[PDB]
Amino acid sequence: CQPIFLNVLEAIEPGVVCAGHDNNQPDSFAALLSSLNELGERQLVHVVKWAKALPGFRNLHVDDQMAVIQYSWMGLMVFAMGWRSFTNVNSRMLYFAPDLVFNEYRMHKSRMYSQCVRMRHLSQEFGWLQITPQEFLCMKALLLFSIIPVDGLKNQKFFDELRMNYIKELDRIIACKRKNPTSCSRRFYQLTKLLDSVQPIARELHQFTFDLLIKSHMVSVDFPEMMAEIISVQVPKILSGKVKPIYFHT
Ligand SMILES: C[C@]12CCC(=O)C[C@@H]1CC[C@@H]1[C@@H]2CC[C@]2(C)[C@@H](O)CC[C@@H]12
Ligand SMILES: O=C(O)Cc1cc(I)c(Oc2ccc(O)c(I)c2)c(I)c1
């Protein structure tokens, strides 16, 4: 147990990132979403640094590195948020950032109440399944390799191999506490189901942010440079079916 791999994941895990939201001003759709967008931009910088530090990531073609990050950031961020919410507030609220916590009122004011419900549900799963910090860490890494173009990447072979190895690492983590061969199988099943559950949530958020970007000027919501570029160039590839999540289960 505690292989080199685990040492690495625990070492590169991003720290706390604030949204920069003004909690003194009364909530408003525009302010809440603009802050969420700014948070996304800030978190993206951390996700990029984190990914480049992942074992074997830099071996992928440079265009594939940027591509997987551009396609998987939503799922990665939502999954990490679900974890923060569970550990910080026991899933009572969505802990996007220390300065941007959503209670039911904000979930409503944000105009994405249903999406927040699914996200809070995901947060609860971390408790219902008793997910460990190590399991969380390995699952999150695997999420970076869980969405690619239907026609493949520049060098699919390398990606396929890397993804396989990350799956193997999850196996090791699972086997490192399951004496009985029955609980080990069940666990992998459970975690892959949890991992898959992230995709539909990310898709709904992709749909929502895309629409928001389109009418951003009319509702006065600001989108930082990178966010606007990725949501108008990469996200549509996902929504149009050119890029799809890799599901474990059908
Ligand atoms: C990824 C972020 C920001 C980082 C995080 O903690 C999860 C959260 C999930 C909702 C996203 C938000 C970024 C900005 C988005 C994409 C808004 O435009 C609509 C949905 C928001
Ligand atoms: O032994 C461990 O746990 C550490 C470990 C983790 C991983 I992910 C891994 O997979 C690859 C695959 C291709 C490649 O170029 C690189 I760099 C790493 C290997 I090999 C070893």
From Swiss-Prot:
Result of altering residue 166 to C: In AIS; loss of androgen binding
Effect of residue 73 to L: Strongly decreased transcription activation in the presence of androgen
In-chain residues carrying the UniProt-annotated modification Phosphotyrosine: 247
Effect of residue 81 to I: In prostate cancer
Outcome of substituting residue 116 to Y: In AIS; loss of androgen binding and of transactivation
Variant or mutagenesis effect after changing residue 47 to M: In prostate cancer; gain in function
Effect on the protein upon substituting residue 112 to I: In PAIS and AIS
Result when mutating residue 163 to Q: In AIS; loss of androgen binding
Disease in which the protein is involved: Androgen insensitivity syndrome: An X-linked recessive form of pseudohermaphroditism due end-organ resistance to androgen. Affected males have female external genitalia, female breast development, blind vagina, absent uterus and female adnexa, and abdominal or inguinal testes, despite a normal 46,XY karyotype. Spinal and bulbar muscular atrophy X-linked 1: An X-linked recessive form of spinal muscular atrophy. Spinal muscular atrophy refers to a group of neuromuscular disorders characterized by degeneration of the anterior horn cells of the spinal cord, leading to symmetrical muscle weakness and atrophy. SMAX1 occurs only in men. Age at onset is usually in the third to fifth decade of life, but earlier involvement has been reported. It is characterized by slowly progressive limb and bulbar muscle weakness with fasciculations, muscle atrophy, and gynecomastia.
Name recorded for this polypeptide: Androgen receptor
Gene: AR
